[PDB]
Amino acid sequence: TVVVTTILESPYVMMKKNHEMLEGNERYEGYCVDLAAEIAKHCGFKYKLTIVGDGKYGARDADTKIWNGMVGELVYGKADIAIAPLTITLVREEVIDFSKPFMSLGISIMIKKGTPIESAEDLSKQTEIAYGTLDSGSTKEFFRRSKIAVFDKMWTYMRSAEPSVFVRTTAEGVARVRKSKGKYAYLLESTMNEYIEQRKPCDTMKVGGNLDSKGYGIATPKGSSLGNAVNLAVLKLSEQGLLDKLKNKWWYDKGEC
Amino acid sequence: KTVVVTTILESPYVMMKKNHEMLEGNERYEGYCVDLAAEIAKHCGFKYKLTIVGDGKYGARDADTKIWNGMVGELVYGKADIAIAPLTITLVREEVIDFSKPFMSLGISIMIKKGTPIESAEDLSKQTEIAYGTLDSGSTKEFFRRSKIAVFDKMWTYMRSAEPSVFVRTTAEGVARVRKSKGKYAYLLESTMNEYIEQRKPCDTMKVGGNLDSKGYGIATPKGSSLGNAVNLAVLKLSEQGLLDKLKNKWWYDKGECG
Ligand SMILES: O=c1[nH]c2cc(C(F)(F)F)c(N3CCOCC3)cc2n(CP(=O)(O)O)c1=O
Ligand SMILES: CC(C)S(=O)(=O)NC[C@@H](C)c1ccc(-c2ccc(C#N)cc2)cc1
Ligand SMILES: N[C@@H](CCC(=O)O)C(=O)O
Numbered sequence: 001t002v003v004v005t006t007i008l009e010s011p012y013v014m015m016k017k018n019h020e021m022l023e024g025n026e027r028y029e030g031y032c033v034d035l036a037a038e039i040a041k042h043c044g045f046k047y048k049l050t051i052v053g054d055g056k057y058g059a060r061d062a063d064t065k066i067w068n069g070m071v072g073e074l075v076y077g078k079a080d081i082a083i084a085p086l087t088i089t090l091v092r093e094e095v096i097d098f099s100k101p102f103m104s105l106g107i108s109i110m111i112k113k114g115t116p117i118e119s120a121e122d123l124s125k126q127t128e129i130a131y132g133t134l135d136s137g138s139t140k141e142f143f144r145r146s147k148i149a150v151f152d153k154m155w156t157y158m159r160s161a162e163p164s165v166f167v168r169t170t171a172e173g174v175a176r177v178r179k180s181k182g183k184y185a186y187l188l189e190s191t192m193n194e195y196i197e198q199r200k201p202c203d204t205m206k207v208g209g210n211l212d213s214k215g216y217g218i219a220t221p222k223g224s225s226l227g228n229a230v231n232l233a234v235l236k237l238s239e240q241g242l243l244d245k246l247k248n249k250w251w252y253d254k255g256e257c
Numbered sequence: 258k259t260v261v262v263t264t265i266l267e268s269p270y271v272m273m274k275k276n277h278e279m280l281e282g283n284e285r286y287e288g289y290c291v292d293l294a295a296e297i298a299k300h301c302g303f304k305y306k307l308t309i310v311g312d313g314k315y316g317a318r319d320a321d322t323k324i325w326n327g328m329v330g331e332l333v334y335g336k337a338d339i340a341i342a343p344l345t346i347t348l349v350r351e352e353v354i355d356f357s358k359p360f361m362s363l364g365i366s367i368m369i370k371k372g373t374p375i376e377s378a379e380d381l382s383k384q385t386e387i388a389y390g391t392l393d394s395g396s397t398k399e400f401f402r403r404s405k406i407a408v409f410d411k412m413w414t415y416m417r418s419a420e421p422s423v424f425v426r427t428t429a430e431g432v433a434r435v436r437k438s439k440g441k442y443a444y445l446l447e448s449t450m451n452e453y454i455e456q457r458k459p460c461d462t463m464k465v466g467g468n469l470d471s472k473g474y475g476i477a478t479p480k481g482s483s484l485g486n487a488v489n490l491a492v493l494k495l496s497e498q499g500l501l502d503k504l505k506n507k508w509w510y511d512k513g514e515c516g
Binding site for chain 1: 346347348351352356358359362403404405406470471472473475489490493494496497498499502
């Protein structure tokens with residue numbers, strides 16, 4: 001049985017409202033739950049979905065040097081595959097493998113409606129409105145490493161801001177936007193931002209274009225016997241239209257806003 | 258050893274400079290993929306020679322002979338070390354060569370003559386006054402032939418049965434058809450080429466609607482080549498540093514003719 005690490009992040013993996021009456025994989029629903037089923041079918045394996053123990057995507061701890069989150073679960077042999085909104089990055093590709101992308105995204109800005117910010121440059125040129133990112137993910141590392149003038153200015157501020165502008169979970173960042181009376185903006189991936197913007201309480205907005213352009217991939221440990229097959233499966237699902245079918249299903253706008 | 262790069266003359270990826278007769282070797286060429294090749298080579302620490310694929314093809318396997326043509330063939334049969342071109346990452350190609358993570362995103366898109374009352378594939382599908390079509394052979398046609406989506410299947414049925422033929426042999430013919438048809442022909446093609454042509458004089462074409470699918474172009478190496486890892490890491494670095502975005506802007510918009 002293949003151990004699949006993943007993360008509770010809507011609409012990728014979500015606990016069903018009736019999860020108590022259910023066991024195993026049937027406890028969960030979402031884009032990545034459907035994707036896991038399709039990959040497993042095409043690759044011919046049985047699997048168990050497991051939510052990442054520390055609730056993190058994955059970064060290499062600065063002093064400790066140890067990987068956390070889903071990345072760490074792969075690196076240290078606790079899981080066989082990650083099927084999640086896990087961003088393909090250079091530092092990760094040094095220690096794990098990724099399929100070609102199954103979904104596009106870029107870093108984006110979420111504000112509470114009415115916040116006088118329209119761009120990353122707007123954020124960088126002021127301090128009245130605080131802004132931050134998720135801990136232990138690709139967005140924070142993006143800002144840490146960027147030499148683009150605006151993004152570097154943003155990083156210089158975020159790293160030293162106090163109270164801390166970083167959050168432990170996407171939900172914490174979104175809640176902070178909603179409760180901060182326009183004084184906190186959140187930097188998060190466009191396909192989470194967009195999902196949230198279309199749903200009640202309809203009090204957030206995505207502003208400006210995306211800051212970058214990348215993708216999520218299915219990740220395996222180096223030398224995994226699954227790597228090649230999983231990549232070909234993603235490509236087949238892409239060419240079959242299945243990935244777009246799943247995206248359109250899970251991001252379907254029911255017109256709540 | 259000098260790395261043999263296979264590529265293709267496709268604008269704005271690779272083209273011969275106006276003064277190419279005064280120049281030699283790689284200096285003869287310019288474009289997005291010429292710039293990309295230099296950055297990849299710098300990061301990987303190799304010298305290289307740009308060579309143009311003999312048959313002018315990207316790469317497909319003949320059903321009868323089983324022979325791979327194009328740049329894919331050059332890699333498969335060990336004639337080139339790397340392909341640096343707008344080469345689409347596909348299942349059948351990934352089975353025989355290695356690809357880097359993609360350096361560019363693309364999808365099927367709609368080109369209209371400015372003024373045409375069409376904003377989407379669904380708009381096209383509902384009508385016949387504005388004819389529409391694509392290359393008579395290729396991935397866009399096959400997308401429509403396979404599609405289970407109602408709108409796209411209706412478009413396929415329309416295109417396959419339309420008289421006169423709504424298909425074209427080349428993009429040059431497709432674009433000329435859009436420009437000469439007074440708004441009565443729309444052309445379906447990859448977003449990247451649509452965006453490029455939107456920036457060419459006489460500035461009378463327009464990309465409309467969202468892309469209908471999602472794919473990527475990648476750098477390819479022979480399967481199991483030891484160059485593959487460094488190349489992939491170089492692509493990831495160039496992506497994260499914003500260099501790929503700079504290159505797209507340079508060749509599509511800074512050198513664009515339409516504002
Ligand atoms: O790997 C591939 N890369 C391709 C790259 C391009 C370009 F856009 F120019 F970069 C194009 N064009 C489509 C529009 O008309 C001009 C040429 C075709 C490509 N094809 C064949 P397709 O997939 O049948 O279209 C491939 O196979
Ligand atoms: C980390 C980066 C080098 S990357 O993200 O690997 N590639 C850089 C970008 C510009 C890109 C991003 C995404 C897709 C894509 C391809 C296919 C499907 C599907 N289905 C969805 C998205 C293509 C190119
Ligand atoms: N997808 C990101 C998590 C979200 C973010 O960093 O904004 C990752 O893989 O790290």
